[PDB]
Write an enzyme that holds these catalytic residues in place. Sequence first.
Site, PDB file in Angstrom:
ATOM      1  N   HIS B  77      42.972  36.593  41.900  1.00  0.00           N
ATOM      2  CA  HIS B  77      43.677  35.324  41.647  1.00  0.00           C
ATOM      3  C   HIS B  77      45.176  35.508  41.662  1.00  0.00           C
ATOM      4  O   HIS B  77      45.867  34.562  41.920  1.00  0.00           O
ATOM      5  CB  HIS B  77      43.166  34.815  40.281  1.00  0.00           C
ATOM      6  CG  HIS B  77      41.815  34.189  40.369  1.00  0.00           C
ATOM      7  ND1 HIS B  77      41.422  33.157  39.543  1.00  0.00           N
ATOM      8  CD2 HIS B  77      40.794  34.400  41.223  1.00  0.00           C
ATOM      9  CE1 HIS B  77      40.210  32.761  39.908  1.00  0.00           C
ATOM     10  NE2 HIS B  77      39.793  33.530  40.893  1.00  0.00           N
ATOM     11  N   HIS B 244      32.295  39.551  45.881  1.00  0.00           N
ATOM     12  CA  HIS B 244      31.032  39.092  45.249  1.00  0.00           C
ATOM     13  C   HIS B 244      29.946  40.182  45.360  1.00  0.00           C
ATOM     14  O   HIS B 244      28.824  39.961  44.979  1.00  0.00           O
ATOM     15  CB  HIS B 244      30.684  37.664  45.687  1.00  0.00           C
ATOM     16  CG  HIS B 244      31.655  36.614  45.181  1.00  0.00           C
ATOM     17  ND1 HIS B 244      31.617  35.284  45.573  1.00  0.00           N
ATOM     18  CD2 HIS B 244      32.729  36.728  44.363  1.00  0.00           C
ATOM     19  CE1 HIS B 244      32.586  34.626  44.963  1.00  0.00           C
ATOM     20  NE2 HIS B 244      33.346  35.499  44.261  1.00  0.00           N
TER      21      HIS B 244
HETATM   22  C1  HEM Z   1      35.632  30.897  48.633  1.00  0.00           C
HETATM   23  C2  HEM Z   1      36.270  31.821  47.959  1.00  0.00           C
HETATM   24  C3  HEM Z   1      35.906  32.052  46.593  1.00  0.00           C
HETATM   25  C4  HEM Z   1      35.228  31.268  45.632  1.00  0.00           C
HETATM   26  C5  HEM Z   1      34.895  29.764  45.640  1.00  0.00           C
HETATM   27  C6  HEM Z   1      35.016  32.097  44.482  1.00  0.00           C
HETATM   28  C7  HEM Z   1      34.470  31.691  43.294  1.00  0.00           C
HETATM   29  C8  HEM Z   1      34.250  32.379  42.087  1.00  0.00           C
HETATM   30  C9  HEM Z   1      33.798  31.828  40.872  1.00  0.00           C
HETATM   31  C10 HEM Z   1      33.504  30.327  40.680  1.00  0.00           C
HETATM   32  C11 HEM Z   1      33.674  32.890  40.003  1.00  0.00           C
HETATM   33  C12 HEM Z   1      33.185  32.916  38.541  1.00  0.00           C
HETATM   34  C13 HEM Z   1      34.318  32.784  37.539  1.00  0.00           C
HETATM   35  C14 HEM Z   1      33.608  33.015  36.167  1.00  0.00           C
HETATM   36  O1  HEM Z   1      32.761  32.098  35.836  1.00  0.00           O
HETATM   37  O2  HEM Z   1      33.768  34.022  35.451  1.00  0.00           O
HETATM   38  C15 HEM Z   1      34.027  34.073  40.728  1.00  0.00           C
HETATM   39  C16 HEM Z   1      33.891  35.406  40.320  1.00  0.00           C
HETATM   40  C17 HEM Z   1      34.348  36.533  40.991  1.00  0.00           C
HETATM   41  N1  HEM Z   1      34.954  36.505  42.236  1.00  0.00           N
HETATM   42 FE1  HEM Z   1      35.121  34.972  43.490  1.00  0.00          FE
HETATM   43  N2  HEM Z   1      35.372  33.349  44.772  1.00  0.00           N
HETATM   44  C18 HEM Z   1      35.927  33.407  46.007  1.00  0.00           C
HETATM   45  C19 HEM Z   1      36.484  34.543  46.590  1.00  0.00           C
HETATM   46  C20 HEM Z   1      36.713  35.760  46.041  1.00  0.00           C
HETATM   47  C21 HEM Z   1      37.430  36.884  46.649  1.00  0.00           C
HETATM   48  C22 HEM Z   1      38.252  36.746  47.945  1.00  0.00           C
HETATM   49  C23 HEM Z   1      37.336  37.924  45.746  1.00  0.00           C
HETATM   50  C24 HEM Z   1      37.898  39.373  45.846  1.00  0.00           C
HETATM   51  C25 HEM Z   1      37.930  40.011  47.036  1.00  0.00           C
HETATM   52  C26 HEM Z   1      36.526  37.453  44.618  1.00  0.00           C
HETATM   53  C27 HEM Z   1      36.047  38.195  43.579  1.00  0.00           C
HETATM   54  C28 HEM Z   1      35.285  37.811  42.490  1.00  0.00           C
HETATM   55  C29 HEM Z   1      34.863  38.654  41.366  1.00  0.00           C
HETATM   56  C30 HEM Z   1      34.974  40.160  41.311  1.00  0.00           C
HETATM   57  C31 HEM Z   1      34.276  37.875  40.480  1.00  0.00           C
HETATM   58  C32 HEM Z   1      33.554  38.300  39.263  1.00  0.00           C
HETATM   59  C33 HEM Z   1      34.306  38.172  37.919  1.00  0.00           C
HETATM   60  C34 HEM Z   1      33.686  38.889  36.760  1.00  0.00           C
HETATM   61  O3  HEM Z   1      32.910  39.873  36.895  1.00  0.00           O
HETATM   62  O4  HEM Z   1      34.088  38.520  35.584  1.00  0.00           O
HETATM   63  N3  HEM Z   1      36.088  36.187  44.914  1.00  0.00           N
HETATM   64  N4  HEM Z   1      34.265  33.743  42.056  1.00  0.00           N
END
Ligand code: HEM
EC number: 1.11.1.21
Lengths: 713, 713
Positions: B77, B244
């Site tokens: 972010h 993800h």
């Molecule tokens: C279309 C693009 C994206 C969408 C809509 C999206 C959406 C989200 C959402 C809704 C969450 C959950 C937030 C929570 O409830 O804790 C999340 C978690 C996460 N996203 Fe994404 N994401 C996107 C792209 C990315 C990219 C580009 C990365 C890194 C390369 C990333 C890495 C992660 C990680 C590591 C988590 C897990 C957080 C945790 O373990 O607490 N995402 N994502």
Amino acid sequence: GTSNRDWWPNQLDLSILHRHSSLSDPMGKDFNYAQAFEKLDLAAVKRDLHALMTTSQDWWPADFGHYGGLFIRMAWHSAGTYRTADGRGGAGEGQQRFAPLNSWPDNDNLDKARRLLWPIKQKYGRAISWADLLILTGNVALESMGFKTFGFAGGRADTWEPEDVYWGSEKIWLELSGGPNSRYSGDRQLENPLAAVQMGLIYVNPEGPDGNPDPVAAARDIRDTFARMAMNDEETVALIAGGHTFGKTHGAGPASNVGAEPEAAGIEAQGLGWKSAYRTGKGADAITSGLEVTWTTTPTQWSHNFFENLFGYEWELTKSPAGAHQWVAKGADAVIPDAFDPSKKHRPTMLTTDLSLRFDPAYEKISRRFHENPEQFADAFARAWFKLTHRDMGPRARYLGPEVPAEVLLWQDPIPAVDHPLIDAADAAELKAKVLASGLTVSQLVSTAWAAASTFRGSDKRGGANGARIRLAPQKDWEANQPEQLAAVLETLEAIRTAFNGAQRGGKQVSLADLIVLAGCAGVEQAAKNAGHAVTVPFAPGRADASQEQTDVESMAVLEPVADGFRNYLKGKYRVPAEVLLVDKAQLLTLSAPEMTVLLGGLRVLGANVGQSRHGVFTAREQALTNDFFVNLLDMGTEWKPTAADADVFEGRDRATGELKWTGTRVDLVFGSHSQLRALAEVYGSADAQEKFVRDFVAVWNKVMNLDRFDLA
Amino acid sequence: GTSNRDWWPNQLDLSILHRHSSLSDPMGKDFNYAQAFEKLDLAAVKRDLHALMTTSQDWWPADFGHYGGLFIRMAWHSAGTYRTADGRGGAGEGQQRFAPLNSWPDNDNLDKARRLLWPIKQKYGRAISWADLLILTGNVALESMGFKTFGFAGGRADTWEPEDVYWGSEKIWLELSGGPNSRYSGDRQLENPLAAVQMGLIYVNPEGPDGNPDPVAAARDIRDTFARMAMNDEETVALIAGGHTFGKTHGAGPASNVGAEPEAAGIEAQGLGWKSAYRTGKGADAITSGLEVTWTTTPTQWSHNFFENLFGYEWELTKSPAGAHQWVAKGADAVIPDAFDPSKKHRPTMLTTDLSLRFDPAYEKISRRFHENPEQFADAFARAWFKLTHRDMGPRARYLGPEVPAEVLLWQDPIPAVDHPLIDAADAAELKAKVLASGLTVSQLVSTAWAAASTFRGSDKRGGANGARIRLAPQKDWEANQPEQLAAVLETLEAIRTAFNGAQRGGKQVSLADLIVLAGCAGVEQAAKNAGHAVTVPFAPGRADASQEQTDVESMAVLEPVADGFRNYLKGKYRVPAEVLLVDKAQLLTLSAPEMTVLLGGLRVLGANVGQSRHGVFTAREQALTNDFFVNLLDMGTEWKPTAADADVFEGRDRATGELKWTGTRVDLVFGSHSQLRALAEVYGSADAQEKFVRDFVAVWNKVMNLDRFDLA
Ligand code: HEM
Ligand code: HEM
Ligand code: NA
Ligand code: NA
């Protein structure tokens, strides 16, 4: 564009501490206005101003062929925004040329006045500031029209963006009282720090209170607002009657003819506003206030006609051509000249607020004295015009040029000349060691010097440690100053002083003002030593001790700190949260956010809190100069909650055990909450920051000690 | 407190040019972050970070005992706010710790992440910035979980207040499209410069467009927003599926349990927010987005299981416990581990936006290739993660530390190494004289050097004169750059260069990038000469020439100036007034208001306007460096009116005679209208200002010439 202000409209605003940066200032960082002014040919400027008086421009023709009245009003509005409560407003920064004051309703057509002065400003450039020019032009107007002024000082440096001033909460120009953001409550109590009756007025409503034309009730508003501008009854009568010896008001037709104020006008208006669709829009057709009054039979010459008219007729309520309430002389002949047509004359007229001077019983006595004794009237008005226009300039050491009056005036908070040799480095070391040997503690020494120095405010440049007025009424009795502890510190310092002075040859002596400051420095040194640090705190001697007869006790009352976050002090409960009041105090002290942060953290661990409150004392080694406040504040091992008894006090508990570690106020915890303050606290709470913290603290401490040192700087 | 913004909500806002002042910065004026960083023990910081990944704090327990996924999201972010339109946003200033980003809904519980890093920040102090730490921690998370990163550069200095960014016009967080402040129009066209679909999101809605859970339509929003963040289809799929691979989403219960975001939370919350009343409020009970998805069977280890799952099951629309749309694998076993209870397992789940990667036909091809070839997937993701986290850092010369990748990437706008001796002061004087002797005019020389240098933007540190990319596609063909005139100048300068380089011994040579700048310097000197003033303009050699093959043409498009008030240029008709666009360009060039004022006034009289427009050319000695722009603008003898043909063009006529004197645009006349700008113009229009004007113009010209010169940093 949605901003942080929109999303979080009650977050604290730190940008008021970072106004007036080198970024916004077009002058180089070395530009010194005092030096530029001292080389101005002031006599040449005044010759050009005299010429201007009667050089009528077609785009805003001169009433009676003379702009004097317009320019007196201009100068009087420049000065007239001043409030004694905070020292904000006044003429001293030239703020009339910036928003909002450039577009306040009461400043209507003063845009024209300022534009008439551009050619002079242009010709002399940086050697005369707009701030100085607006006042000097008012003086020359009075001189051109036969009135001898009491003098004039230059030295008001220009500013380059608007000052952050609380002018009230109303969201409508000129809103009458009792609205949702009323500046009034109870029995017509005006809220501090305000000094005017309606948003966008200088002092009062010229028709009467909330538009009701009662001269007696108008007088009450006059007395209150002028008192809040540091003027008493004699000065108020002298100024109003003095002013209204000249010129005229403008209300030749309805106000609906007049368009947008300068900040709202089209780009083509080139900084002007209030363009009028009534007839020619100017001169004989001018519309400014809406009132149409001309006071005297000779509006371009000093006379004694204002009080002759005021007392010599009975007055009838009538309306101007725009519909405003005003008064006309019963059965009078048409003796008042017209501003443009030599074949017309008019009956005498008066504002509601003019009649105040006759129908308020206390004003009536002064007004009659001035009527019967016009020389007393002239002298009072000259003195009051000087006070009006200099009241926010600060110590006489700041006054420049060859017309500065020699007479020292009480409202200048005068400080005696120094007439003897000053102490040198060796003597300062001797005195520090004697202070530390006396038994005075770090806490006492730091608290006292803080209390002495932190009365300074950059708004009107009043206050500070010079004068040693902390030993006098009323400062010695202020609660924030801890009168009984203060008395004990001052007693011991005074014995030290006496002994040092009695041992000298030559004329050498130390003032108590200097010794208070130096003792505070010895406390800071000792604190650093307690922390295992060698530190030298700078000190500049040369303060002098003022007498009680040089210290107006009623005028000093506005400097009392009723909120001082630096000593975790709040005298009562206020509508504004305590952190807002802290940032306000930092602004008056001229501190940036990083300076405010460093200073408060240090003060906490040095024992500067009023009453030795433990709130914010986040250290186990009080009286040692360390960054403990930041390190402990930022420790995530501790959890904070508001208390039962008091939502403004917080308890910090170990997150694992539940045990109480500390308590703090809002002023303490804001540094752990506000995202910009916390970023500052992090720098000083880092493991590599102990030396930085000390050296930053000493610098800001010395800054505060020197705030009023215009004799040096 | 009613403010100027309240009274005049559409006046131009200059305070965005005066952020980042020495006043607000706690570090000393001499603090150099790169020097501090180069002595950091980066290996020791990474060891601390590695330990932290599996040291759970009870105030925010680690999912699966590992914070990796949380920190990857935090870093993505930090970086993910970046827009290619203006270069604003991104990770390079550590803006996630300030408002508004700290309290954006999509940054929910990242406050927890940042707080977990305070003890390391504290330990290493000024040697590692928060900005760098956010990114490094994301890298260390990936490393710790078995992913090989592409490298890391330090050098992002911390900032101390929020950046002024246009994030959209909506007044409600997360407002769906088609409201009164809709960021969409036409056929789902997102307004420039925005890069996200709803106020307070990073890119897209994880439920689907405006909450509609259709993967195919979601893919459209993904593609659009990622493109607007400078990522193509391959990079987007790699980033989303890479990310993800780790961790989980949090939606254990309803969102009405969650309290105020950090900027709205109580002072006791100490900079944290989103305090939840649901069960324990954290860990197993955590509520963040509202979704409850865990993507892989090993959330704390790099794998190729995201694509195994994506393609290995069919998906069914379902709801999380908070009510959000999300997808579950039809008939799957419970193979996904629970984050806290070792005896529970869950079926595979996906976001709508995850399924986009399979159901959008272009994404599906890349996703299959990555599924079948996971080594390709790891390489793409490593490269994309580096680009994501570095895209706003600027030229490679700013990259610090021992892990900077040696491979030069096209998206870096790379500049070749200089491998020969540079020209000296005598050589520079010789080349200036040759330039002036060629017949090239002041206007040509100034215009060309302006065109080459003024592409710089401080937001992502792209652009500038280094590279001589003005000679290449696409810059050589941009309308603002006057392609035919440009080509003629460049031809002549290239012959001068050839002749100078051919005459040297010993390998010395001058680049065209340096000669374009030096020629511009000769033009400003000659202009000063024409005005009767000998000045030397500084010049620093060392620029190099990039090739067409080292220039991505499609990526260069965002640097085209479609509005440049410095050249009185507007490529089309915009919703935003031209003056606002001028101040926006000034901000991207890192200019203060006085710098913008002096530079514009000078450029006018030098002939820098596109197309030799006479608008704002308020001089009868064009090509002489004088303050005539200000003197003539501020002359009250001239009256200004908008033209019939065009409300945005104005005629200045003699006020007495009616005679046409000048024409100008809004950009010209704003300096005579806006209260703060007019105060600046007055300084440079004064009779004493010629020397000042010259010197300040040369300083700001040189400043612009050197904006991208990080090799001299
Ligand atoms: C279309 C693009 C994206 C969408 C809509 C999206 C959406 C989200 C959402 C809704 C969450 C959950 C937030 C929570 O409830 O804790 C999340 C978690 C996460 N996203 Fe994404 N994401 C996107 C792209 C990315 C990219 C580009 C990365 C890194 C390369 C990333 C890495 C992660 C990680 C590591 C988590 C897990 C957080 C945790 O373990 O607490 N995402 N994502
Ligand atoms: C109760 C205090 C006061 C009230 C309510 C007040 C009200 C006004 C009003 C409404 C006008 C007319 C504006 C116009 O339509 O052009 C005006 C004019 C003026 N006032 Fe005051 N006034 C006050 C005090 C002062 C003071 C203290 C001075 C100076 C010492 C001053 C000097 C002037 C002068 C010279 C003019 C004439 C302007 C011209 O000829 O263009 N007044 N006053
Ligand atoms: Na003031
Ligand atoms: Na950026």
